[PDB]
Write an enzyme that holds these catalytic residues in place. Structure first.
Site, PDB file in Angstrom:
ATOM      1  N   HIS A 134      70.109  99.640  98.417  1.00 58.69           N
ATOM      2  CA  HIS A 134      71.314  99.781  99.226  1.00 58.69           C
ATOM      3  C   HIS A 134      71.420 101.090  99.992  1.00 58.69           C
ATOM      4  CE1 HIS A 134      73.177 102.206  95.939  1.00 58.69           C
ATOM      5  NE2 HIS A 134      73.947 102.660  96.912  1.00 58.69           N
ATOM      6  N   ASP A 152      69.046  95.976  93.041  1.00 62.71           N
ATOM      7  CA  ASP A 152      69.178  97.217  93.795  1.00 62.71           C
ATOM      8  C   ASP A 152      68.030  98.148  93.376  1.00 62.71           C
ATOM      9  OD1 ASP A 152      72.140  99.362  94.306  1.00 62.71           O
ATOM     10  OD2 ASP A 152      70.279  99.175  95.444  1.00 62.71           O
ATOM     11  N   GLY A 189      76.331 109.749  96.673  1.00 62.93           N
ATOM     12  CA  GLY A 189      75.429 110.836  97.002  1.00 62.93           C
ATOM     13  C   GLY A 189      74.267 110.785  96.023  1.00 62.93           C
ATOM     14  N   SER A 217      73.387 108.003  94.391  1.00 63.90           N
ATOM     15  CA  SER A 217      72.824 106.654  94.365  1.00 63.90           C
ATOM     16  C   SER A 217      71.295 106.671  94.311  1.00 63.90           C
ATOM     17  CB  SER A 217      73.299 105.861  95.594  1.00 63.90           C
ATOM     18  OG  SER A 217      74.721 105.778  95.656  1.00 63.90           O
TER      19      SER A 217
HETATM   20  N1  LIG Z   1      80.858 105.851  89.387  1.00 62.22           N
HETATM   21  C1  LIG Z   1      79.573 106.115  89.661  1.00 62.22           C
HETATM   22  N2  LIG Z   1      78.820 106.593  88.720  1.00 62.22           N
HETATM   23  C2  LIG Z   1      79.010 105.825  90.982  1.00 62.22           C
HETATM   24  C3  LIG Z   1      77.620 105.451  91.194  1.00 62.22           C
HETATM   25  C4  LIG Z   1      77.206 105.052  92.524  1.00 62.22           C
HETATM   26  C5  LIG Z   1      78.124 105.024  93.653  1.00 62.22           C
HETATM   27  C6  LIG Z   1      77.783 104.611  94.994  1.00 62.22           C
HETATM   28  C7  LIG Z   1      78.766 104.607  96.082  1.00 62.22           C
HETATM   29  C8  LIG Z   1      78.512 104.175  97.474  1.00 62.22           C
HETATM   30  O1  LIG Z   1      79.281 104.461  98.377  1.00 62.22           O
HETATM   31  N3  LIG Z   1      77.384 103.431  97.695  1.00 62.22           N
HETATM   32  C9  LIG Z   1      77.024 102.882  98.899  1.00 62.22           C
HETATM   33  C10 LIG Z   1      76.619 103.671  99.997  1.00 62.22           C
HETATM   34  C11 LIG Z   1      76.264 103.064 101.220  1.00 62.22           C
HETATM   35  C12 LIG Z   1      76.298 101.671 101.343  1.00 62.22           C
HETATM   36  C13 LIG Z   1      76.703 100.871 100.246  1.00 62.22           C
HETATM   37  O2  LIG Z   1      76.856  99.476 100.242  1.00 62.22           O
HETATM   38  C14 LIG Z   1      76.190  98.735 101.266  1.00 62.22           C
HETATM   39  C15 LIG Z   1      75.025  97.909 100.640  1.00 62.22           C
HETATM   40  C16 LIG Z   1      75.433  96.433 100.728  1.00 62.22           C
HETATM   41  C17 LIG Z   1      76.794  96.349 101.480  1.00 62.22           C
HETATM   42  C18 LIG Z   1      77.181  97.767 101.967  1.00 62.22           C
HETATM   43  C19 LIG Z   1      77.048 101.490  99.037  1.00 62.22           C
HETATM   44  C20 LIG Z   1      80.103 105.032  95.797  1.00 62.22           C
HETATM   45  C21 LIG Z   1      80.454 105.435  94.475  1.00 62.22           C
HETATM   46  C22 LIG Z   1      79.502 105.434  93.415  1.00 62.22           C
HETATM   47  C23 LIG Z   1      79.910 105.816  92.105  1.00 62.22           C
END
Ligand SMILES: N=C(N)c1ccc2cc(C(=O)Nc3cccc(OC4CCCC4)c3)ccc2c1
Length: 245
Positions: free
Chosen positions: A46, A97, A196, A198
């Site tokens: 993702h 993922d 950040g 991820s």
């Molecule tokens: N609570 C956690 N440990 C944790 C762990 C991981 C996390 C990831 C995102 C996040 O914003 N991820 C993200 C970034 C860009 C795109 C995305 O999704 C797209 C992929 C398919 C549809 C849109 C997710 C936000 C919060 C998060 C919080």
């Protein structure tokens, strides 16, 4: 990272910093990864799905800060970008993922292991730590959910693993969390990974050997009560990783 401790790359030699160039020249930080072997890094799908162009990505190993060149680092390019061919993203849960980036320097060589550029081992079939086990996550993700800038220095914290049934209770993730994902969080919810981080390495010391047990995938908010950080269960994707390498 929310809470946790600041740190240097010498403590996480398998951490990959992936940034991406934008039309115009400016380059921003995307996600973190893990050095599988001299030529391979493993992250989350993702972080790339929306910008599948391998040329746009940049990757570093042995880098300690976000906008500084750490003595010992190496700048790479993504030779091959492979996204799980069965990935999808629901309201919260992210399926399969897991991705792969075959790296390459401008000269054409892969990564040269060093005191700050090492590898982490994949878990073995049917063998994951028991619940309640402490593990560590690393990254340049947010320190607080209300911020917009990523910390300037690398960070890391320790969390615990939460069983599948406990994570499927209603006030948690119900039937949204499936068995190809692992939950993990601070019993006091003061620390947790966050946007950040991820695709970050979730290292668990299993039976003596530091193991890459999960990749940072998703979670509701950051460090919120009854909202564990979900991760990809690497042990499951072993046949997949093997054939795609
Ligand atoms: N609570 C956690 N440990 C944790 C762990 C991981 C996390 C990831 C995102 C996040 O914003 N991820 C993200 C970034 C860009 C795109 C995305 O999704 C797209 C992929 C398919 C549809 C849109 C997710 C936000 C919060 C998060 C919080």
């Amino acid at each position: 990272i929310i809470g946790g401790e600041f740190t240097t790359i010498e403590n996480q030699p398998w951490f990959a910093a992936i940034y991406r160039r934008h039309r115009g020249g400016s380059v921003t930080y995307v996600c973190g990864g893990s050095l599988m072997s001299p030529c391979w890094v493993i992250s989350a799908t993702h972080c790339f799905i929306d910008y599948p162009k391998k040329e746009d990505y940049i990757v570093y190993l042995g880098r300690s800060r976000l906008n500084s060149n750490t003595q010992g680092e190496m700048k790479f390019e993504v030779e091959n970008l492979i996204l799980h061919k069965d990935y999808s993203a629901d309201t919260l849960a992210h399926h399969n993922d897991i991705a792969l980036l075959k790296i390459r320097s401008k000269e054409g060589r892969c990564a040269q292991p060093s005191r700050t550029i090492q590898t982490i081992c994949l878990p073995s079939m049917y063998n994951d730590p028991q619940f309640g086990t402490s593990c560590e996550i690393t990254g340049f993700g947010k320190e607080n959910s209300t911020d917009y800038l990523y910390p300037e220095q690398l960070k890391m914290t320790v969390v615990k693993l939460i069983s599948h049934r406990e994570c499927q209770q209603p006030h948690y993730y119900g039937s949204e969390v499936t068995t190809k994902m692992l939950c993990a969080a601070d019993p006091q919810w003061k620390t947790d990974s966050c946007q950040g981080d991820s695709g970050g390495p979730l290292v668990c010391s299993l039976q003596g050997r530091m193991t890459l047990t999960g990749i940072v995938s998703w979670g509701r908010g950051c460090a919120l009560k009854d909202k564990p950080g979900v991760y990809t269960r690497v042990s499951h994707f072993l046949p997949w990783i093997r054939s795609h390498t």
